[PDB]
Design a protein around this ligand. Structure first.
Ligand code: PMP
Ligand code: PMP
Ligand code: PMP
Ligand code: PMP
Ligand code: XE
Ligand code: XE
Ligand code: XE
Ligand code: XE
Lengths: 455, 455, 463, 455
């Protein structure tokens, strides 16, 4: 007769008969506690330096989210003020990225669940534009390809799910990104677009759309093939407009037909928010828009999702209102300041070569380094990653894709709430780890599992 | 210069600085109040009988959601307990639908944001299975079609986005649903699958998979053509297993390779929860599964979205645990009792012809009706709907699709929280409106806009 | 052949248990206990059918929420206003409010440091108290003069219902100066005509419920002076300043309406209107000890000696007084002036904007020197824009708004007006959105001419 | 230069600018803290045994009241559900007190802010009924009187405010309440009615209506004069129906035309809730009723107040619903158990004579006693009351009215939350005080201020 020390009663196991739908009722408050108690086993992510997504808490965001638990984004009739708020965000994000001022006062874009949806949506519209143009000219439309650099996994999914051929320019030592030369070599009249990554996941560096844009202009000159771009700005999109307004990467570039980003990365929204914006009505094929009947007349949607919570848009709106440009600038500078500082300090502690050092004009606030080629300080980065985990930190070590499959890097993400003091403390732990490693030479070479690298 | 009476300070208009990204910071607690006050203009949906989604509030769900605001469903490393709760639900749903007990102890399915993503996933798997089968028979794969009845807009989206021809059997009078005879005429060797809708959005009725299944068995006998099904049980999927276990619609049928439903409809989860289950490992082409690397190995996802909150899954788990089968039977029975009462009471109040009378063996808890042909009681259903809005209720009137385009109906949705007393009150207001329309005959015919119908 | 699995009793989807109905079982006192949390949920659930009043522009009462008012109210649920013994600190606070209000209205500085006045549940109670004391003063002056006291009358303009109640309940004849086109208010000429030696007082309404205009007490005061010079009859006033009472002192301190005028013997107003207190708070102040006849004061024994009360109510919560005190303290003259100005800004903009949308004649355009923050208008005479204000009201309800249209009293019973109340929380942005919905409705009414003339029920007009 | 230690800032005194309206703004949170701090000087009433009103806290009641802060009882249009609940309460109270089942389904009554207004209202209705009768008979209506026993102050108010001669039958030793003999001596054709008090404030005893009713029946036989009754059941009204249903005091007696009670006494509602119910339509002269226009028709009010919170009615409803008869019987008995106990136990502690010992068939849960005539234990009750204050308790010692002005009583009110355990502790403190008075004989005779005795 198994008992539970919590309830002073007969034990209900969650693991026994977690394989069948449960047969019986159980008191609501007991069910709540059992789950609540399980959840203590989840991490809080504050010491997690792998993830990009918002992990900090603001009481106001909890209140907005909690008011919004039942508020259906798709139901414009019942929730007309949430609907209004969503459209302001669309306009505000469009403005931020130099979208040509919209003819009717309303920018062409949509909120999404994350950058993943936002990319498939950008992806579909590219395909359709390329398909329309090619049928008009009487040509085969069965073999579209996409040209890009070391892209996030959403692009591999989009390519697979929509039968487009992924021409990914491989990462290679001393050329880790998509350069203009290799881009051009991979393009022809079946290329639907080119996708630069404005903040490479693996390393934190920017892929600068301008030099690529110039190559595509030249390419049109030489071949007559007119290629559009879509900027995956999952993280850059809410960084560069504030701390590096000089970098031309957005709608300021004529070939850029759409951009996407994550609200719930550096836009500071809570998990469950992305954005995609098109340059104008022509960037978005009408065949893709579905009009749904409501009382005030009908509205068009381009989204994969239908019903879903409006909480994250309202929270996004709250970030936008309370910070503005002036506010976001100070926030993102804070992060860059932390990244820079970690970068300089870590350089002093071993023979490291730095792929990314958290400068605002090169990428996102991220430190990314590898060991110097053919040097051996007595540990690998997997080893050091293991030591830091014992001190509560999740600092991922992993190998790159492509022809740089030989290279192991360590990458640190600096997000909101990882302030200068927690960086100090990481550093103390970092140093203590180097010390234990050197006191225990036997540890070398042992750890060999990659960590989660994707978001 | 303009002041605000809440703050006794210079006014900030959210409607003036609404077009561009704001330049200045504002005090957090003022942004919060500004937004909080706007959201009072949203409805609370408790008198809305137009929607399927949960709008009831339970204190434990709010707590679970609130703890879960940052829990990343995709980050199995940091949130391993959330990961575990998710997998449990997958098994529990599979079990509910009579999926073959799984070999390795883990059923084949995934959580989704809603039924929209669930259906595209199932839709994509149908396409690939059909493709693989044609390529083996050395036949062309360029003209896929999908056969179905009056489906929810997500299937129109699917067919557009993925280049499949939608053969929608049209609603017509005395013939609203996909019947076996009409289904068979639309089938051929390019049909990727047939999708019954187990709870038709427009009317509430079930399309019964079993007689369709018999027709497809006969169809393969006669032509050698072996057509699969995917059941869109958006609403029925959490009703029938409890209050009509003897309706054979699920994996008990060999042709049914996958099923989807909404957790946030009758599965009682909060907004942002959907499910899709496949019959077994072979129903899911591996080319569609993506393996992400993590510390404890690697898990395979099939999902359009990537990062996204885990609260909904956790809340769904709460509902499963606290109610079980005995609980859910009680809960759904309650809604059924309401709808059946409403249908009986309303029938006595006008010259009405009923398409759906809210019985558990016919469909979901919904009453759906139209005016009897050639009868004219001095008003239209649009008219009665507008009178009802004035007494706070949202009871939609709209026209059916296909050939029944001519037909106006009123459709009442009974969800959790809309209890017998509330139904009594609506009944009073309905009578009160009937009277006011009879006292003011000039009102007949004026209102003619369709209401939100789609979920 | 069955396929179902049903239970043979009525169930509730919330509780997965047997149904309990509030509606049958609403007829007799209930016989059985029920679980507390279930009782609570059943009730809380029903209350979602109440409006939140944010789009209700018919009411004067406070509808905005402020976290601190909620906490203060929540601490005070049990605090009994009448129980000076147990809640000496609440008693102190109440006394401070009375002084601050007196002070705000230029009451003569009290001899003993304590003004003569009381808190009440709302203006209704305030007014009966003012009316009672007026009646008693007059009764005594006549008894002194050995005259008959059985036929008292009260002169006033288009007043709120409470005066109709007071007049009935207390056997006083109501000489209401009737509203009529182009003279909607008690004017000096018609007031004088109604006045004789049984007039206990004249009651200017400083903020008319129906329209929002001020009846200005000073011209009336002048007439009443001239009237004494001619007849020797000495008539008192009492100002029903229900709403204007917490407006003019901040935005129009030059309008002479209060104790600055010697005939004004008491003033009443609502804290839970432009006072900004939460529902259930009024005030009445007497000029001095002599204005409140001792016969009306009841003395009750407490441990610290005895205190005198002039209240209709006895036991009652102190929350609103404390809440009112919070408002006074946190705002001051400086804060009120701002908060009040904000509301007048909304009214002025609505009035200037709405004027452009149809053929309207304006009774009140929300100007600080004319009345309260209210917009009140009627259709111009003999214009037919294609709808009545009743119809326009209806289309507005469908968009969530409650903007009343109702007929005026007296001889103007032939006029339909629309009135918009602008209170705290109804800010410029919300006024922008009303304007959009108003425009949308006009467009709907113009594309759908059959709607004209159909709607004809009066909306709630009184507070 | 003066500082506050709480805010480490320039001091604000509430005592300075308690004289004039304040000039300046302060920070909201500071204002709030200042006030909150002063409130700590208020008692919490748990040891106050002088009062009648509810002083116990229940979480649900707090939430309801807090939901209802803006809910306007008069505004039937905006808060239709609060209106509906109000009306149910009228019906439940009517039934409770054996009112004749109302014709049209709605009993004639109204909620009020307390017993005081409810008494005013019943009083006016009495004065009108007599007025109308007398006019019809062509007789003087200028000299109305009221006959009553030791009434609560509201009846003295009633009489002054409405020009009715109060004929209060005075208390006298051995005869403390209105008895039929003296009642009849005071009655005539100008008597608007007799008011028995069903739970006398000063003592706790019931004035029994039935023997008076017989006296009034006999009276009408001898003289032709027909005299109505109003019961003041401020406290008795929510006691006898549960623990003494046999006492015939209510609408079972035909001459009872109206009854009034406090919700916030033994009705268990929070402060600000009273009831008055009429026997039927005819009991309530239509002159007194005012019709206000709303949209759903028009409603009749008979109230002194106009705008006011609906929180308390709602709270009252919750108490009714959750408890019922069976609950109320339990709650009320428990209080009687306490007062019975105190009465037996105090009896043993000195030379006391009891006026009221907390028996259900005699009065409310109160103990009221005086020192035995010509007996001197060496203290007065005033002295005992003061000793008890020192140890936290408020136990009032006062003198009775009329011809018992020679008499000092102590009176203990036993209300909800003053449970057996607290009585026990009062007894301990009671014994210690007597011991202190015994050891310190000088203390005797010194204290002489009457306590608050009225509610
Ligand atoms: C470049 C890029 N694009 C897409 C994504 C996916 O974003 P989300 O998880 O917000 O859907 C990420 C995060 N990995 C990314 O770095
Ligand atoms: C049959 C069906 N399938 C798909 C959906 C879409 O579900 P969701 O809102 O969860 O995306 C609905 C609800 N409209 C539906 O009725
Ligand atoms: C002039 C006037 N008098 C008194 C009142 C009554 O006040 P209350 O609702 O606060 O009791 C009102 C509106 N009710 C009013 O506007
Ligand atoms: C018998 C009697 N009648 C009337 C009242 C007045 O009650 P309230 O304070 O609820 O107005 C009381 C309160 N002492 C009472 O006991
Ligand atoms: Xe869009
Ligand atoms: Xe999967
Ligand atoms: Xe007073
Ligand atoms: Xe009433």
């Amino acid at each position: 007769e198994l008992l539970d020390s919590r309830f002073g009663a007969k034990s209900i196991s969650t693991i026994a008969e977690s394989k069948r739908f449960p047969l019986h009722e159980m008191r609501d408050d007991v069910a709540f506690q059992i789950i609540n108690d399980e959840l203590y086993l989840d991490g809080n992510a504050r010491q997690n330096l792998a993830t990009f997504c918002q992990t900090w808490d603001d009481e106001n965001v909890h209140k907005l989210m909690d008011l919004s638990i039942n508020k259906n984004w798709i139901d414009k009739e019942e929730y007309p003020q949430s609907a209004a708020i969503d459209l302001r965000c669309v306009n505000m994000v469009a403005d931020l990225w130099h979208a040509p001022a919209p003819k009717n006062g309303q920018a062409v874009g949509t909120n999404t669940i994350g950058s993943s949806e936002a990319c498939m949506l950008g992806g579909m519209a590219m395909k359709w534009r390329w398909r329309k143009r090619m049928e008009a000219a009487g040509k085969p439309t069965d073999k579209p390809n996409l040209v890009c650099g070391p892209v996030q996994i959403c692009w591999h999914k989009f390519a697979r799910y929509w039968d487009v051929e992924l021409r990914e320019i491989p990462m290679r030592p001393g050329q880790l990104f998509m350069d203009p030369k290799r881009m051009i070599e991979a393009c022809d009249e079946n290329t639907i677009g080119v996708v630069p990554t404005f903040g490479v996941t693996y390393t934190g560096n920017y892929e600068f759309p301008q030099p690529l844009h110039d190559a595509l202009d030249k390419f049109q000159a030489d071949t007559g093939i007119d290629i559009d771009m879509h900027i995956d700005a999952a993280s850059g999109g809410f960084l560069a407009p504030f701390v590096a307004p000089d970098i031309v990467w957005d709608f300021r570039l004529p070939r850029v037909k759409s951009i996407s980003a994550s609200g719930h990365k550096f836009g500071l929204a809570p998990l469950g928010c992305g954005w995609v914006i098109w340059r104008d009505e022509e960037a978005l094929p009408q065949e893709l828009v579905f009009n749904v009947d409501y009382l005030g007349g009908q509205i068009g949607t381009f989204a994969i999702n239908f019903s879903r919570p409006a909480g994250q848009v309202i929270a996004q709106y709250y970030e936008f209102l309370r910070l503005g440009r002036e506010g976001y600038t100070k926030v993102q500078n804070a992060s860059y300041q932390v990244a820079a500082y970690l970068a300089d300090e870590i350089a002093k502690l071993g023979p490291y070569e730095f792929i990314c050092t958290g400068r605002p004009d090169e990428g996102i606030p991220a430190v990314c380094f590898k060991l110097k080629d053919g040097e051996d300080p007595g540990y690998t980065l997997y080893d050091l990653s293991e030591r830091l985990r014992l001190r509560g930190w999740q600092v991922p070590a992993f190998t790159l894709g492509g022809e740089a499959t030989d290279i192991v890097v360590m990458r640190i993400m600096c997000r909101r709430g990882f302030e200068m003091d927690f960086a100090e403390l990481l550093l103390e732990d970092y140093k203590a780890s180097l010390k234990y490693l050197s006191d225990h030479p036997k540890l070398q070479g042992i750890a060999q599992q990659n960590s989660f690298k994707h978001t």
